Design an enzyme around this catalytic site. Structure first.
Site, PDB file in Angstrom:
ATOM      1  CG  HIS A  45      -0.441   0.366   2.490  1.00 48.86           C
ATOM      2  ND1 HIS A  45      -0.215  -0.572   3.475  1.00 48.86           N
ATOM      3  CD2 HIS A  45      -0.062   1.556   3.014  1.00 48.86           C
ATOM      4  CE1 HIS A  45       0.289   0.023   4.540  1.00 48.86           C
ATOM      5  NE2 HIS A  45       0.395   1.315   4.286  1.00 48.86           N
ATOM      6  CG  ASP A  76      -0.506  -3.721   2.660  1.00 45.34           C
ATOM      7  OD1 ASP A  76       0.215  -3.397   1.689  1.00 45.34           O
ATOM      8  OD2 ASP A  76      -1.018  -2.887   3.439  1.00 45.34           O
ATOM      9  CB  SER A 154       2.706   0.483   8.034  1.00 47.35           C
ATOM     10  OG  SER A 154       1.876  -0.590   7.643  1.00 47.35           O
TER      11      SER A 154
END
EC number: 3.4.21.-
Lengths: 200, 200, 200, 200, 200, 200, 200, 200
Positions: A45, A76, A154
């Protein structure tokens, strides 16, 4: 820990913030980490619709030009590489250790957004999501920890007690955020993902 | 613990609360603690634009006139002193112990705002922010604990299991507050801060 | 645990809910517990402006008419008694054990509002407020635990690991509620309160 | 009728314990009121509650005047006041009441926002009416709602129609709050009942 | 764990979402588990007003037609069965172990809504509700854990450290949700429920 | 047409378990309705649901009257009622329906706020219209929205135009809520379909 | 008077530490202002605070002009500016002030939303007036409130009456925020006092 | 011009991973649009994004028609569509555009709320205008804001003036949301630029 790199890319927002204005875009931050075979793991992402993704190691200010090898859609995860060899010089890839259990302490290492410092976050595995094939065998699909992963982190690695990697980390987006809830993609998913890439 | 003093100052609010009215100001509370060499540590954000800061020890009602030695801008730390010698009589400065690790219990001692009683707060180190020089060496930059530091406590000392100081404490201002999240400035930052002062 | 009684009283709301209507009032619930000397402890805020307070033991449905001996204003403590002797028959007063420390597990026993069942709540001492006399001596003033005390429970006893009482429990009213935060009045306060009553 | 509107000062003690081991917090509050016929002042019941003495201030000066509480409503949030000082009444035309207002009537509410000595004037329209019915089919105005938020200090001040005549006492909604844009007014019939019940 | 089945039913919403439209209905998810005697436990609130409830085991995609034996009204428990024998082939019913204590770790196993994967949630018994008969005996009535049970999981089994069942699990509906608070119905309630069914 | 507006009493049992180990909570609720032609009363479907008996009250007296449920809508939140007692109908002119309202029309909503016996009158304007279309190009009013919040007890009461003629049944928005200032009205065509489907 | 409205650029440094171990965050901000008689520009005090230099932009071009800070208010949020560049003033008619506005007056607020260079025009009506009183009974307009939200960048822009004449400076409410639909305007008397106090 | 308003169907895939180990959630969405001159349909860009095929529905029938995406805006949230089926266009008068609207103009917004096939008609007034300026002093309408909330499915539908002529495309505010009562409209000049840039 010296394998944990910072990811720079350009994030184009999903929505028109005003119907008469071009979609707002700006440069974003993200995290990743070096695995074996001159490969860098990170989230998908942050590299979608990319024009160019640039990496950066801990002590250096030098940015490097990464090369998107694959971008997952089932998970992801993005697989990157760098052509420069000065990048891979003197850096040890992470090692993948045993799958964690419930209440196991995990550690998430990443670069918080808007800075070059490394953040280290403590969390415990508070929930697991488990796959189940028709064969009868069950593999681990998802991990949830009781600590929030702040934005830039992340895509960084998650470690067990023994400093061994147990997956990729993710800020909880859906439902409510920053309420002490983080997600982690377990190693078997990462494996399948690389397998589906190499084989095809 | 007898080294933990209460800080009195005048806080002028940052915003006009109504555009046609003078900025609202009123007296505020804060916390600090005595270190070696007739010095008192506290936060900067309570002594900025000060006219006069007054201190107070635990059992006494007597206030003392503090003298602002330095006010940090790279970090929220202020260095004070008192000319009166009755202040430093019969008080033992805190001792600085080992840097804490993740999940280490810490204790934060301060005076909650609007009262003279001491509050003692239990928290655990839930996150660390780590500096990284180009030399290759890494120093500890930030600590986050899983307990909220109520208003007046900010600037008081944080202790490890052994009653040894490990930094200055801070109420979490940004994002959401009182959601069990506090900050602590580790000792190396305090050191650098004093070093930059003494040397210059 | 057999010393923990349910308190019935009439609660008149503090505010007009509509300026043209009489203040809304209705019957409320609260908790208390039997101590030595035919006395029952509970909170003050449930017996203020009272006309009559009625108690009730665990297994029985029989209500008893309590007699308000004293109502604190420095602390939220009320001292009751019952003239009937059938009340005190076959019930053992709680025993007061050692003052708890930070992170000590406590147990809060009370009757949740709108029912006769007993609720038992687990919490840990997350914060302490400490008094400091000019003599130099410090007594314990306040305890905060990391578990919410639901409405009816307020006024019940708090026990340590050893089933010994360590104070009266209180639902957190100020700031935000039901966010895992409860208060407990330590034994020394209860002592002072009874002392100020008996002596005067 | 600006000159008839006065600022009410009273020491307000909160209905709750802020912490169970402290006295109920207590601080000076502000409110509004207005001069009527026959050496009387109307204000709200809630501000003048407890047996605290209440002071009054007028538009031009900062002079306070000691007030006497004649009657405190219980069926409605109205209090009737008077002041011994003859200079208080000198050169002030009391408010004049007017026709019962209807739905969608424009009203004006005059009062002193809390914390300041300046007069506020808020626009509003009657959005809802509460109506009482008798055992024979008669009807009486009981309450009025306006589509304007009335700020705290304004409670007790007068509400005027287009023709500048008073048409009730203004109140803020205690829950909901605040920018729901809802405001309450007690209409004249209720005020009249309050005064008749006083005199008789 | 192989005894934990997924429940499919049709949920008709309780409210008109618009007064001029039929009540919104749609298919919902829920969880249950196999006990001894060809019986499946689950919650009542997912099989009320049912037309047909269909079950599903872990590895298989085959749905089975369940038969509602009983639906509780004193407690949120439903008792089901299946006529097909292929359902009960090669599956071991759960075993009921010792009642948990405060702070005891529990594990909740269920199917999160909108998927076929199994979720395993870690929680600790943070509160107990205790029944009290006039005989003098007390049975366990309610358990509360410090972890949220996501929607589809409700009705699945809760296990102690030893992989033994200690009750049925429930998403916290009342008050606020997803704030790390779950409910569990202890075994004695389940017993009474089955007893009241078999005997009558 | 004040006299035609009646208060509806019914025992409401909640759709959810408050706690999984307790009976669904159940308490007396309040609502509004109104008298129409032919010995009938219109109110909402949701209040009279379950097979609880419903009582009615009129404006002047506190006399309740037992009502008979003739029809409960499912395609819309309307219920049709009647009362056997002849004294209920005596001396009451039923409401008269008027022209379909248009956008920006001023309407008035009459009803009994929950908890009280007094009549409320709320102003509002038609802010939105939902319109049904037929397979040939015909159009029918389906729903109306007004820019006024309708308080709970008012649901079921009548809505009037400038000329005092009824123009639908009033409803509160169940989500959102509350001071979003949104209110719903079911227009007459739907009421007419409901009654025609009853008679036929 | 579109041409007189200018966009203000200043480097804004936040009043708080985002984290106690980092410099106070600092970034470029945007605001509005407008040209008046005598080579002057009015804007707010809060945007031009600190000794940062401020730039101005006009409606048509992207040319910035360096501004000189003549006076920064403290009794009110007004700043007076000028620009040395003669081309800044060329071909621009300054705003003309008009009559004091009354309650329910329609006003128009002109400014530049933050982040963009386009001009915004917001409708609004005077909803509240704050009025100052003198020791002799004189009255002066102190503040105005409008029933429109003023978006961030618009603070400092002009407010106009129906006749297009300026009638104060527009401001957004810093708390509450944002869609409470409340906006502030400093009326001309205050502006006049600010300028007279400047000149004298 | 009811007949020109059509309902848009497209498969919407979310921009985020709901969970990092699952495919991005994907579901059918709804939106509005309208027929214009020259066999064209205007709708929003955001609904028809991705290379999913889009269907159209008309007011009377449930017949869907396959649409062709001619152009998707990037400088604004507008998409231009057409339909091959000749029966789609038969017996439909396209919308007619009208004068640029001014502040406080009453507008009407027509569209299909999401989930249903019925047409909604929402009232509103122009509350704010965003205006573009050219390097020579020319001005063009860029955006419109209305004081009405536009519900999700309505985005893409037309906005009309008092005279029933189209005056832009309606949009809901994606943040804030929802009952802030704010709505956006893209005025005709922007639509005209979009189409001219298409044709050229």
């Amino acid at each position: 820990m010296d394998a944990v790199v910072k990811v720079f890319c350009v994030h184009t927002e999903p929505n028109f913030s005003l119907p008469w204005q071009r979609k707002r875009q700006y440069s974003s931050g993200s995290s990743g980490f070096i695995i074996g075979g001159r490969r860098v793991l990170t989230n998908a992402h942050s590299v979608e619709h990319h024009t160019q993704v640039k990496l950066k190691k801990r002590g250096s200010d030098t940015k490097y030009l990464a090369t998107v090898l694959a971008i997952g859609t089932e998970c992801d995860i993005a697989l990157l590489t760098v052509t420069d060899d000065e990048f891979w010089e003197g850096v040890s890839p992470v090692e993948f250790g045993d799958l964690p259990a419930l209440q196991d302490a995990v550690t998430v290492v990443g670069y918080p957004i808007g800075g070059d410092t490394i953040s280290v976050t403590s969390g415990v595995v508070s929930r697991m999501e488990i796959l189940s094939y028709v064969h009868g065998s069950t593999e681990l699909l998802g991990l949830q920890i009781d600590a929030a992963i702040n934005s830039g982190n992340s895509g960084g690695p998650a470690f067990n007690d023994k400093g061994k990697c147990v997956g990729i980390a993710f800020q909880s987006l859906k439902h409510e955020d920053a309420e002490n809830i983080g997600y982690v993609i377990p190693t078997p998913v990462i494996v399948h993902f690389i397998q589906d890439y190499e084989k095809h």
